[PDB]
Structure 1
Amino acid sequence: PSQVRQNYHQDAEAAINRQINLELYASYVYLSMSCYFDRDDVALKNFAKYFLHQSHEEREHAEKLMKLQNQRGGRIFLQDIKKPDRDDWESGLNAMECALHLEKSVNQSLLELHKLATDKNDPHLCDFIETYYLSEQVKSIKELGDHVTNLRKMGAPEAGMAEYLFDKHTLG
Structure 2
Amino acid sequence: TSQVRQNYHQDSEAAINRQINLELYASYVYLSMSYYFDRDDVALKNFAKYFLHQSHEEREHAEKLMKLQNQRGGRIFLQDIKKPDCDDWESGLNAMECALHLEKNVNQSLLELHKLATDKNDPHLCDFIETHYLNEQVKAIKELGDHVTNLRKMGAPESGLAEYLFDKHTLG
Q: TM-score range by the shorter chain?
A: over 0.9
Q: For 1:32 and 1:167, how far apart are their aligned partners in 2?
A: 18
Q: Over aligned residue pairs, what C-alpha RMSD do you find?
A: 0.3
Once the two structures are superposed, what CA deviation does each residue of 1:129-159 show, in whole Å capped at 9, x if it has no partner?
A: 0000000000000000000000000001111
Q: For 1:77 and 1:159, how far apart are their aligned partners in 2?
A: 46
Once the two structures are superposed, what CA deviation does each residue of 1:74-104 show, in whole Å capped at 9, x if it has no partner?
A: 0000000000000000000000000000000
- Residue ranges of structure 2 left out of the alignment (5+ in a row): none
Q: For 1:56 and 1:12, how far apart are their aligned partners in 2?
A: 25
After TM superposition, give the deviation of residue 168 of structure 1 in Å: 0.2
Q: Secondary structure at the match of 1:164?
A: helix
Once the two structures are superposed, what CA deviation does each residue of 1:50-70 show, in whole Å capped at 9, x if it has no partner?
A: 000000000000000000000
After TM superposition, give the deviation of residue 160 of structure 1 in Å: 1.9
Q: For 1:160 and 1:111, how far apart are their aligned partners in 2?
A: 37
TM-score, L = length of structure 2: 0.99
Q: Extract structure 1 runs of 4+ deviating beyond 2 A.
A: none
Query: How many equivalent residue pairs?
Result: 171
TM-score, L = length of structure 1: 0.99
Moved more, 154-163 or 53-62: 154-163
Q: For 2:126 and 2:71, how far apart are their aligned partners in 1?
A: 15
Identity level (%): 95
Once the two structures are superposed, what CA deviation does each residue of 1:8-57 show, in whole Å capped at 9, x if it has no partner?
A: 00000000000000000000000000010000000000000000000000
Q: For 1:98 and 1:163, how far apart are their aligned partners in 2?
A: 16
- Residue ranges of structure 1 left out of the alignment (5+ in a row): none
Q: For 2:22 and 2:47, how far apart are their aligned partners in 1?
A: 23
Q: For 2:160 and 2:147, how far apart are their aligned partners in 1?
A: 17
Once the two structures are superposed, what CA deviation does each residue of 1:93-128 show, in whole Å capped at 9, x if it has no partner?
A: 000000000000000000000000000000000000
